């Protein structure tokens, strides 16, 4: 509350460390469904169903231009990529499996770097 604060966690490396995670996600062999925005002209149903599209290149641009206020808003966009994937793709498909694999890969790096 006013004039009463928990000890200050050092967040000075968060930007660099999120960049590193994102580089690791970009270079994973199962990243291909997520590297670029889904083409809303060429994929029937996507635009109406997926209210907030997200992909790795859009997170990279947001990260590089100071559009994440803190490391949690960064994690929320990464998770959105996988939540969108699950919304639109059957679990038993190449893309559905890719999304589960990448979400696991992310959540481990996230815990190991920050928890």
CA 106 to each of CA 6, 24, 36, 62: distance values in angstroms, whole numbers, following the listed order: 28, 9, 18, 18
Torsion of CA 96, 102, 108, 109, to 10 degrees: -160
Range 1-115 has CATH code 1.20.920.10: yes
Angle at 78 between CA 101 and CA 51, to 5 degrees: 105
99 closest CA partner among 68, 59, 63, 55: 55
Angle at 25 between CA 19 and CA 31, to 5 degrees: 145
Write down the domain spans for the chain: 1-115
Distance CA 59, CA 113 (A): 18
CA 5 to each of CA 8, 10, 21, 71, 114: distance values in angstroms, whole numbers, following the listed order: 8, 14, 30, 20, 21
Q: Which residue has the tokens 């966690």?
A: 9
- Say which experimental method was used: X-ray
Asked whether the CA dihedral 101, 106, 109, 115 is positive or negative, the reply is negative
Asked whether the CA dihedral 6, 9, 12, 16 is positive or negative, the reply is negative
Q: Which two tokens stand for residue 58?
A: 């859009």
Q: Widest CA span of the chain, in angstroms?
A: 55
- Residues with Cβ within 8 Å of 56's Cβ and at least 6 positions away in sequence, in order, are 22, 25, 26, 31, 34, 35, 36, 81
Q: Which two tokens stand for residue 18?
A: 């999120």
- Count of residues in the chain: 115
């Amino acid at each position: 509350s006013m004039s009463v604060k928990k000890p200050k966690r050092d967040d000075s490396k968060d930007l660099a460390l999120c960049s590193m995670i994102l580089t690791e996600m970009e270079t994973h062999e199962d990243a291909w469904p997520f590297l670029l925005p889904v083409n809303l002209k060429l994929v029937p149903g996507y635009k109406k169903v997926i209210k907030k599209p997200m992909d790795f290149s859009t997170i990279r641009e947001k990260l590089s231009s100071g559009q994440y206020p803190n490391l949690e808003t960064f994690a929320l966009d990464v998770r959105l990529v996988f939540d969108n994937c699950e919304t639109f793709n059957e679990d038993d498909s190449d893309i559905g499996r890719a999304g589960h694999n990448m979400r696991k890969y992310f959540e481990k790096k996230w815990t190991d770097t920050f928890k």
